[PDB]
A and B are shown apart, each in its own frame.
With several copies, the nearest count.
Chain A
């Protein structure tokens, strides 16, 4: 019955700090502890630490003791987790999880949905969108050097679905991302019909469409 809702995705540069929150339904004062557990892509969960109600005491894991601070605002039904001196291996999904009782312990019976923090040295950048020009035949769009994920590519304002294939982005050594979207189309239609690819990168507020001609 208790819902744990966490704050939005965060994107940070190395050596800075993030502070995630977690709002628990009911209360607002609680009789159970809350913990923070993270999970890195392809890895098992790691417990970070938790906070005990009324007592207010905190317990941290060896791995983080020294750069994590867990705090509470009991009137708001909210606990916070701040992790500083960030590194790229802190890129992970961060879960708040409640225990059955007042002690922090191996048993956590309700979890939040998760919130991602990405630690990269890239600043946020909007894409450059180039056309990829033309039995069938292929056309597409190069969506080049943007940070961070995601980006939306639709063809003809979402009209063309048949034969379309957007590819997972590549992670360049520069830290920036690039992807490309391709559509197989009948050669007979080439120099009469019209193809626009609609690139939207929310994080950068860049909306682009690029007409693809031969």
Chain B
């Protein structure tokens, strides 16, 4: 994908996160578990919902054939009528098909972007209090219990509060144990 997240550096998705499109999996002393990100999933639903509505709305006026009859010596205008009417069915079919194809790509790329951005949200909260492992996961340099996890999930992680514990752990790791 254009944003390299879905079926990219995050290889494959989670059958087990059922309550949203994007979210988190965590793992600590008290266990592990999945949790949807409500806010991103909601922005996405808003986007896609609006998109589907805009498509319906723009296709609202659009050519509507009407039947006209012509006698056997009005063949030139019967042909001009057929071609005019076929001409519009063709313009409109192209418009619908191409809009659908073009917007499908954008939609699929929109979600990809949404996962990248969420990953980056967590990345820039944690900074060097966690280590980027490369598969979509962060490994903390400090103990992070369920309360601390939620703080990551909801925008509230206090970096200063853990950084001391973080610097001690990074220290132990560089030194070799």
A touches B in complex, CB < 8 A = yes
Chain A contact residues, CB within 8 Å of chain B: 27-31, 53-54, 75, 101-103
Bound Cα distance A33, B42 (Å): 11
The reply to whether B56 and A31 form a contact with Cβ atoms under 8 Å apart is no
Collect the chain B residues with CB atoms within 8 Å of residue A29's CB.
49, 52-53, 56
Q: How far is the CB of B52 from chain A (nearest CB, A)?
A: 5
- Which of B19, B48, B49 gathers the greatest number of chain A CB atoms within 10 Å? B49
B residues 22-47 in Cβ contact with A at 8 Å: 38, 41-42, 45-46
Q: Can you identify 20 A-B contacts, CB atoms within 8 angstroms? A: A27-B53, A28-B53, A28-B56, A29-B49, A29-B52, A29-B53, A29-B56, A31-B42, A31-B45, A31-B49, A31-B50, A53-B45, A54-B45, A54-B48, A75-B56, A101-B38, A101-B42, A102-B38, A102-B41, A102-B45
Instruction: Count contacts between A and B, CB distance < 8 Å.
Output: 28
Cβ contact of B46, chosen from A27, A31, A75, cutoff 8 A: A31
Collect the chain B residues with CB atoms within 8 Å of residue A53's CB.
45, 49
The reply to whether B42 and A30 form a contact with Cβ atoms under 8 Å apart is no
Q: Classify the interface of chain A: helix, strand, loop or mixed.
A: loop
Bound Cα distance A53, B38 (Å): 14
B residues 46-76 in Cβ contact with A at 8 Å: 46, 48-50, 52-53, 56
Q: Classify the interface of chain B: helix, strand, loop or mixed.
A: helix
Bound Cα distance A180, B48 (Å): 59
Bound Cα distance A28, B49 (Å): 9
Collect the chain B residues with CB atoms within 8 Å of residue A28's CB.
53, 56
Closest A residue to B55 using CB positions: A29
Collect the chain A residues with CB atoms within 8 Å of residue B48's CB.
54
The reply to whether A102 and B42 form a contact with Cβ atoms under 8 Å apart is yes
Bound Cα distance A53, B48 (Å): 11
Bound Cα distance A167, B46 (Å): 53
Collect the chain A residues with CB atoms within 8 Å of residue B41's CB.
102
Bound Cα distance A111, B97 (Å): 36
Bound Cα distance A30, B53 (Å): 9
- Which of B45, B46, B48, B52 gathers the greatest number of chain A CB atoms within 10 Å? B45
Q: How far is the CB of A52 from chain B (nearest CB, A)?
A: 9
The reply to whether A103 and B49 form a contact with Cβ atoms under 8 Å apart is no
Bound Cα distance A152, B165 (Å): 79
The reply to whether A103 and B19 form a contact with Cβ atoms under 8 Å apart is yes
Q: How far is the CB of A56 from chain B (nearest CB, A)?
A: 12
Collect the chain B residues with CB atoms within 8 Å of residue A30's CB.
49
Q: How far is the CB of B176 from chain A (nearest CB, A)?
A: 45
Q: How far is the CB of A50 from chain B (nearest CB, A)?
A: 13
Bound Cα distance A144, B52 (Å): 56
Bound Cα distance A71, B134 (Å): 41
The reply to whether B49 and A54 form a contact with Cβ atoms under 8 Å apart is yes
